Ligand binder design. Structure first.
Ligand SMILES: Nc1ncnc2c1ncn2[C@@H]1O[C@H](COP(=O)(O)OP(=O)(O)O)[C@@H](O)[C@H]1O
Ligand SMILES: Nc1ncnc2c1ncn2[C@@H]1O[C@H](COP(=O)(O)OP(=O)(O)O)[C@@H](O)[C@H]1O
Ligand SMILES: [Cl-]
Ligand SMILES: [Zn+2]
Ligand SMILES: [Zn+2]
Lengths: 380, 383
C-alpha cells in the first residue's frame, strides 16, 4: 500500500481492495474504540456496506469486549448536506444504547457530499470525535477528502456552515472507481489534470498518454468476476495518487494553495449559472480552458500550451467550451452572459486569477492580479 | 486595565467600566473588521446595548469605511442554547446586507447561556470567525468564559453538540455585577470559593475575610448614581480575578490539573441532575463541595477543622451547604434525593468506584488529580 503523509502525519493509505481487506482491520488497531459509526447514502452503501459489516465482524471477534458497528444511511444527493440530516445523525447517535461516546470513530463512506456532512458531524459531536475519510468518487479521492474542510449547505448557499476537522485516516481504495458512474469519474478527472498543469509537465504528459487507455476501461462493460481496470491498474494508481499527493503537499504548507484554484475563478462563475445540471469538474474544465486563454491573451502563455490543455481535457471526456453539445442539452441552452459571469466572479476593480506561463509552471507563486476588461475578452 | 494572559497570549482584559469606555475602542483597533455582531438576551441587552451602540458609533466614526454593528436579541434562559436558536442567529447573519462574512467579529454579551451559544455559532460560521467574550454573570467571568468550550443543548441533554473555539478577547467588566441578580451573584461565588480551596489557603482565607463585606454590597439598596461596590472595589477585583486567573492557568497547562476544577462537581452534578432547573449550578456545587469535603474527612484525608471552614465560608456567601436548606426545600417543594438516585446520576458519568477530587487540606489537593474512591465510602456521606 502507498502512504502519503499529510500535515506531518501518515493520514493517507492508498491501494486496491482496501475496503475489503484493510480498513476494518486497521481501524480496530490504529483507531482503537468501542463505537464505529459508518455514514453513507443508499447508493454506495447497498453496494459496499455488506462486505464491510462482515470484514468488521472478523476483526472485532478477536477483540473483547467486541466493538460495535453502527450504520447510518441517508438519501443520495447534496440534499443530505443539510442542518436537518446532521441533527438526525447526531440524535440517532445519542439515541444508541449506550449512546455513542467521545471515543466514537466515524467512517465517512461516500463522495464530497457524504464527506463534508460526516466530517462536520464528527467535528462537533460532543465537541469533536475522530473520523476517517473513505472517498468513493474520484473527485473526492484527489481533492475533497484531503484537507479537513467540512460543512453543510443552507438555502442561502453552499458550505456556509461547517468546520475544519482533519480526518484521522484517509482510505483511498481505487476499487470504488469500478462502480462509480462514468460521468462522475470524468468529472473528477478535471481536478487531476488541473493539479498536473500547475505542478508537473511530465505528469501532464503522462495524463495525455494514458487518456485513451483510462477512458477505455472507464467505459468498457465489465463482465462480473473481473476488474474494470484489469491491465491499467498501475497506470491509474499513478495518475490518481499524483493528484492526491499534490493536494496533500499544498495542504501541509501561503500562495501555494491559491494555485489549487486554477480554472476555478472562471470555473465557479460558470457553475453558479449552470449548476446543478452541470457538475463541478465539468465547469472547472471550461474554467481552465478560459483562464489559459486569458494567460495567452496577456502574453504569459503560448498558443501551443493552450491547445494541449483543451486537447487533454477533451481526451478525458471533459467539456472545453460553453458551446459544447451535452452542456447545451443538459441545460436547455442556458446562457452565461459575459456580464453575469463577471458579477459572479465578484461575489467571491480587478480580479485575482491563477495564470500559467507554461504547462506545469505557474506565472506567479500565487493568483496574479488581472484587469476586468482583459477577463471580459475571453468570456465570449 | 488588568490583563490576564491565557494560552500563551493576552486575551483577558479585566477592570471596571470596560463596556463603557474600552470594549468598542479596543474592538476597532485590535479586532479590525467591517462587521461586528452583538448577541444577547432581552434582559441584559435592554440594560447595556444602548450605551454600547453609542460608544461604538464614536469609534467607528473616525475609521472609514464605517464598521457596522449588527445586534441580535434572544429570549433569556437556556431555551436559546438550542439548534434552532443557533440556526436563526446564523440565517440572520447570512441574510444581512451584505451578508456577514469571515472577517466578522462576534461579541458574546451575556452569561454562560449566551456564551456557549455565541461561541459555538462563531466556531462554525463559514467554518469559523473571530469572537470575544463579555461575561455578565459572575459564574461566567471566572469560569464559563475562560476556556473556549462552547455548545448548545438538545432534548437529550446539555452541551451535547458544540465546539472548542477560543475567544480572541475576554472582557471582564466588573460593573456587570452591579445589575446581576443577587441569587446569580451568589451562584457564581461557589466556583470562586472552589478555586481557592484547591489552590490557595491564603486566597481562601481572604474569601473568609471579605465575605461579610461583599455580601453587604450585593444585598444593599444603591441610591441613584452610586456604584454598588463603592468602597469595596479593589477587594472585589482581587477575589474575582484570582479565580479567573486560576481557570486561565489550568486551561493553559499543556492533565489532572483540569480534574481539580471538578472539586465538588462529582457529587454536585449528581444533585443538580435531580434538582435542576429549580436549583442553580453553583448552589448544587456548594453542597457538592461540602459533601466531597466530608468524604475526604471520612477517608481520613481531610481534617474536621478544614471541613468546617468550607461550610462556613460557603454559608458566609449565601450558598447552601446541605440539601435540607430551607430556601432549596421551598424551591423544590421538598423534592427528595435518594442516595440511590445520586449514585446513579454519578454513574451516567461514564463501576465499583467513582473518581473524586479529594483535599488533604484547604488549598492542598490530596492527589494531583481525581482520586479513586469506592462506592460504599461515597454512599456514607450521602446518608
Ligand atoms: N464508488 C461509487 N459507486 C457507485 N455509486 C457511487 C460511488 N461514489 C458515489 N456514488 C454515487 O454517485 C453520485 C455522486 O456522488 P457525490 O458524493 O454527490 O459526488 P462528489 O464527490 O462529486 O460531490 C451519488 O448519487 C452517489 O450516491
Ligand atoms: N450582568 C447581568 N445583570 C443583569 N442581568 C443579567 C446579567 N447577566 C445575566 N443576566 C440575566 O441573569 C440570568 C442568568 O444568566 P445565565 O447566562 O442564564 O446564567 P449562568 O451564566 O449562571 O448560566 C438570565 O436571566 C440573564 O438574562
Ligand atoms: Cl452545527
Ligand atoms: Zn474544485
Ligand atoms: Zn462548575
Amino acid at each position: 500500500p502507498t502512504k502519503i503523509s499529510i500535515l506531518g502525519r501518515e493520514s493517507i493509505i492508498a491501494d486496491f481492495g482496501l475496503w475489503r481487506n484493510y480498513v476494518a482491520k486497521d481501524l480496530i488497531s490504529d483507531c482503537s474504540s468501542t463505537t464505529y459509526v459508518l455514514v453513507t447514502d443508499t447508493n454506495i452503501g447497498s453496494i459496499y456496506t455488506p462486505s464491510f459489516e462482515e470484514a468488521f465482524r472478523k476483526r472485532a471477534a478477536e477483540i473483547t469486549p467486541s466493538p460495535r458497528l453502527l450504520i447510518y444511511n441517508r438519501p443520495p444527493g447534496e440534499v443530505s448536506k443539510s442542518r436537518q440530516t446532521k441533527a438526525d445523525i447526531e440524535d440517532w447517535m445519542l439515541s444508541q444504547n449506550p449512546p455513542c461516546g467521545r471515543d466514537t470513530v466515524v467512517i465517512a463512506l461516500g463522495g464530497g457530499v457524504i464527506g463534508d456532512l460526516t466530517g462536520f458531524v464528527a467535528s462537533t459531536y460532543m465537541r469533536g470525535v475522530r473520523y476517517v475519510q473513505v472517498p468513493t468518487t474520484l473527485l473526492a479521492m484527489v481533492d475533497s477528502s484531503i484537507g479537513g474542510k467540512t460543512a453543510i449547505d443552507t438555502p442561502l448557499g453552499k458550505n456556509l456552515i461547517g468546520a475544519i476537522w482533519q480526518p484521522t485516516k484517509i482510505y483511498i481504495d481505487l476499487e470504488f472507481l469500478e462502480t462509480l458512474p462514468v460521468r462522475e469519474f470524468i468529472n473528477g478527472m478535471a481536478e487531476v489534470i488541473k493539479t498536473a498543469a500547475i505542478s508537473s509537465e511530465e505528469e501532464f504528459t503522462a495524463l495525455e498518454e494514458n487518456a485513451e487507455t483510462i477512458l477505455k476501461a472507464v467505459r468498457r462493460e465489465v463482465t462480473p468476476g473481473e476488474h474494470r481496470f484489469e491491465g491499467t491498474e498501475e497506470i491509474l494508481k499513478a495518475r490518481i495518487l499524483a493528484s492526491a499527493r499534490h493536494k496533500a503537499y499544498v495542504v501541509s504548507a501561503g500562495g501555494l494553495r491559491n494555485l489549487l484554484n486554477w480554472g476555478h475563478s472562471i470555473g465557479h462563475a460558470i457553475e453558479a449559472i449552470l449548476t446543478p445540471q452541470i457538475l463541478h469538474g465539468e465547469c472547472v474544465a471550461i474554467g481552465m480552458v478560459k483562464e489559459a486563454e486569458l494567460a495567452r491573451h496577456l502574453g504569459i502563455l503560448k498558443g501551443v500550451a493552450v491547445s494541449r490543455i483543451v486537447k487533454c481535457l477533451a481526451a478525458y471526456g471533459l467539456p472545453t467550451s460553453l458551446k459544447d453539445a451535452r452542456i447545451r442539452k443538459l441545460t436547455a441552452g442556458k446562457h452565461c452572459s459575459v456580464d453575469q459571469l463577471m458579477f459572479n466572479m465578484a461575489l467571491d476593480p480587478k480580479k485575482k486569477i491563477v495564470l500559467l506561463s507554461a504547462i506545469g509552471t505557474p506565472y506567479e507563486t500565487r493568483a496574479s492580479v488581472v484587469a476586468n476588461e482583459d477577463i471580459r475578452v475571453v468570456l465570449a
